[PDB]
Amino acid sequence: NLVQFGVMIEKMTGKSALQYNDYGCYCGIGGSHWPVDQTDWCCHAHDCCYGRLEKLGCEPKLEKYLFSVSERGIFCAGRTTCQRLTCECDKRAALCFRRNLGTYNRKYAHYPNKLCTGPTPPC
Ligand SMILES: Cc1c(C(=O)C(N)=O)c2c(OCC(=O)O)cccc2n1Cc1cccc2ccccc12
Numbered sequence: 752n753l754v755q756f757g758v759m760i761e762k763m764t765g766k767s768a769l770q771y772n773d774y775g776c777y778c779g780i781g782g783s784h785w786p787v788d789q790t791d792w793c794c795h796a797h798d799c800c801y802g803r804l805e806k807l808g809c810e811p812k813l814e815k816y817l818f819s820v821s822e823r824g825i826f827c828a829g830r831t832t833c834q835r836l837t838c839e840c841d842k843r844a845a846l847c848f849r850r851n852l853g854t855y856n857r858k859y860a861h862y863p864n865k866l867c868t869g870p871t872p873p874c
């Protein structure tokens with residue numbers, strides 16, 4: 752489930768994984784309408800990533816993988832290809848979060864779902 756991804760987020764962003772829970776309109780379970788900012792797009796893309804893995808027969812919500820963080824980046828591993836794929840989806844998201852640290856806004860943390868409006872952009 753969520754333990755490894757939370758650890759990855761904390762390592763790459765310096766924030767608790769709680770700070771990306773219910774962030775904007777996409778971070779947290781599900782999501783809909785238009786992303787509020789770049790961080791939120793990371794989560795929209797991550798949702799898309801997981802949907803791709805589900806079509807491949809993986810269960811990314813549950814897969815347990817292994818990873819380390821050296822200086823040259825995040826190294827992903829696991830017994831199965833589905834575990835390694837899930838790690839790749841998470842990696843891209845954690846890197847996306849880090850890259851957009853400059854526009855992270857606390858006002859979007861724990862965002863009320865009523866404030867999510869507009870169309871839902873496709874994957
Ligand atoms: C950032 C994020 C997520 C995403 O990347 C996203 N795209 O929605 C995420 C998440 O995404 C998958 C989904 O939308 O089904 C589900 C639950 C918590 C999530 N979180 C928050 C979160 C991430 C990692 C570890 C957590 C541990 C405890 C509580 C919340 C945690």
Ligand SMILES: [Ca+2]
Pocket residue numbers: 777778779780781782794798
């Ligand atoms: Ca989501």
Ligand SMILES: [Cl-]
Pocket residue numbers: 830
């Ligand atoms: Cl295993």
